[PDB]
Symmetry: C7
Subunit: 75 residues, 7 copies
């Protein structure tokens, strides 16, 4: 999309499964349902991963953008 609008890539993932990598190495998987300029975001049917192992099924969750390291598409 716009080379000045990197958050659009997030819009290109609305209702899709994403992978949230947090500072401290924590990982989160779920369906992106929204986000804002601060990258705060809402995940649906989100699950907390550890070394690739689900360790917590939270359901819907709001993640503060400040903690995010990266967001990538996943299955």
């Amino acid at each position: 999309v716009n080379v000045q609008r990197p958050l659009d890539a997030l819009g290109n993932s609305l209702n899709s499964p994403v992978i949230i990598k947090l500072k401290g190495d924590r990982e989160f998987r779920g369906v992106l349902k929204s986000f804002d300029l601060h990258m705060n975001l809402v995940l649906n049917d989100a699950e907390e991963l550890e070394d690739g192992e689900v360790t917590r099924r939270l359901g819907t969750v709001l993640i503060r953008g400040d903690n995010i390291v990266y967001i990538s598409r996943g299955k």
Copy 2:
């Protein structure tokens, strides 16, 4: 429906707050602001899934929050 707008849909509901450093909280959300500072009623701290201290009503600065989820009353 921007992220914070979700918190509104949880006002007066039991939520679970996860803080930096792996500290966790549980209580009924009564208010919040854009910075995600928030007030919890009948709150209580948790460690490894077991309550460690009941703090009743408490104000949490959003800066320390990692995520917030839906919870249940016991």
Copy 3:
């Protein structure tokens, strides 16, 4: 909305201030700004629930606060 506008209700009441690092304070909230910087009279710095120091009047920077709860 009103988290801040709910701290005022404790103005002149005993509060507990938990900080990053687990250091905690107890005392009478006397004033605060929107950044959560606040003043405590008859303050006490605690550890493990044990009074570590009697500070009297103290100004704490909000930036180090984790949470504040209504004391007793």
Copy 4:
């Protein structure tokens, strides 16, 4: 005299190297970026001391965690 973020502009659609705090490393084609250096990479790959550790495809990296960005091969 192009300031810091222009040199970034000259790498648009070129492979780059992003080095994060905590020493984690990434490689991928730079697709976009903002003033905060929040950026997007396509064909992204995370590295383990010069050894590919994970293929991420398209990824959005928050600038705050970045240390430096270098040109790629």
Copy 5:
């Protein structure tokens, strides 16, 4: 003190000895000479402390507010 003006209490400690706690469990004592909006301070006759005992004499020093955890005056 004004319920919305915490820094006021700093104004009340001017030219009065104070205790400054910094991030990293470090401490300093001295006489408050000036402070600004960000809690940057200037202490006269300052001293760094550790375990309650002096670690170093610094004289006049300018402390950046950001490193401050809390500022204590006395107790009356």
Copy 6:
């Protein structure tokens, strides 16, 4: 120079070799090509050192000022 414009010093190093010292102690050396008010900067023919021994040659690189502790002449 201007006792009010410390970044003027950076201006004086444009196209000269500098030593960038980062948080965590990492260290970079290269030729300063440009910078902004946040001290974000570009270096040509840059190299990452370790205890005085270059351990990586990055050529042109963009360093976020945020990680910088200090910058010296080389």
Copy 7:
């Protein structure tokens, strides 16, 4: 009446000691500084345990790392 940043101004061109987070320490002549306290030292020297460890000549220090500034030497 004096304000921190202005008092700093009182030390332009005199020796000052800059103490940083991590406990690294530098000494040199204050040559310039802005509101963020990013500043410049001429004849700068980093110390460790109280003994010079390296002479860095002119150096630009980011205020963000600064804990305190004191009149030294």
